Amino acid sequence: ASEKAARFVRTCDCFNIPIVMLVDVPGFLPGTDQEYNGIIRRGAKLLYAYGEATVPKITVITRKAYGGAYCVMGSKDMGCDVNLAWPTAQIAVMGASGAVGFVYRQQLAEAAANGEDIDKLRLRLQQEYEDTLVNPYVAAERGYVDAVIPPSHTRGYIGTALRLLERKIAQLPPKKHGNVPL
Amino acid sequence: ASEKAARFVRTCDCFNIPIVMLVDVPGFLPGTDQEYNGIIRRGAKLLYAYGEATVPKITVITRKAYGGAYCVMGSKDMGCDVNLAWPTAQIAVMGASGAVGFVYRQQLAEAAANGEDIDKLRLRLQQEYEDTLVNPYVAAERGYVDAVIPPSHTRGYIGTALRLLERKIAQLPPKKHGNVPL
């Protein structure tokens, strides 16, 4: 997936074609093969290609955007110009399921002593962490998201955004060429 | 191997490190996996890297150099500055072994019908072709090799070459960046 998008992004940038990405990743496909085959190395090609791009860049998160997945899929701080998120956006370090495990390490400690029953407080906290953090507003407040608009507005937004970014002047530092991971 | 070299070559070029190539490849490793995994696509990277480089390039063929492998290996027409070859070099389209099958096609066709002895004919032809075409002089005469020198002379030759190409001038086509296969 990464090499597919990485080369496509680089091609678009070569011929001044704006890049519009619709982001909905939970993360990276788990597996030893991915690692053995070089997911780190080969996956980094997407980051490089996108960070290097100078054409207009508009990213729309319709749903999931966790961990490094969020970083590679048109992250504001990766150079994305305009970033939009739908009400169903879930921008977070990781899923609430595995998030409570770390965040609520202590409260889960006594869970094996006093009121035991992991599944009621390891399931309640999950839904509590999910209903208070897993959303687009935490990122919207950090500016990582320009605005949280209703799905229907996407079409008109990209239209106007592409006009504003039309004469976008941008370039990379002086150098014969970069050293993208082959 | 291709990817391993490709990236390395690009790195040298990034930081102005002359690229010295010791050639001796009989070709590419056969196998369905090599294909399925994308040898064509990934193999190109070594080609891309070298063709892109602008740093002094010196190539020395110590023995074998067949077909495409010959090309991708700092070949003269690939942009290499100085190409050297050892008396034991075997520069050709392919090994004399499978060459006779194409070249002396008809002659071998009448080795099964009329005068039949193939395998004692296919070994005489394989030797004649080998002793007349598979050598460093065909290429040297074409200019693809700057000179055919003794192995001992190698070290000193690379030394003067590096000096000559010291302040080499190489200008790559104006472009935000290339589109090397990923």
Enter the CATH topology name of chain A: 2-enoyl-CoA Hydratase, Chain A, domain 1
Radius of gyration of chain A: 19 Å
Oligomerization status of the protein chains: part of a larger assembly
Largest two-chain interface: A-B, 21 and 20 residues
| Strands of chain A, total number | 5
Order of helices and strands of chain A: HEHHEHEEHHHEH
SS content category of chain A: alpha/beta
The termini of chain A sit apart by 15 Å
Text of the CATH class of chain A: Alpha Beta
Q: Considering the protein shown, what is the CATH homologous superfamily of chain A? A: 2-enoyl-CoA Hydratase, Chain A, domain 1
CATH architecture of chain A: Alpha-Beta Complex
Total individual domains of chain A: 1
The general outline of chain A is: globular
Strand residue percentage of chain A: 5-15%
The description of the largest β-sheet of chain A is: 5 strands, parallel
Helix content of chain A: 25-40%
Number of helices of chain A: 8
Essential attributes:
part of a larger assembly, 2 chains, 182 residues, alpha/beta, 2-enoyl-CoA Hydratase, Chain A, domain 1, five-stranded parallel beta sheet, 39% helix, 14% strand, globular, ligase, carboxylase
Task: Write a short abstract of this structure.
The structure is cut from a larger assembly and holds two copies of chain A (182 residues). Chain A has 182 residues and is of the alpha/beta class. Chain A is 39% helix and 14% strand.
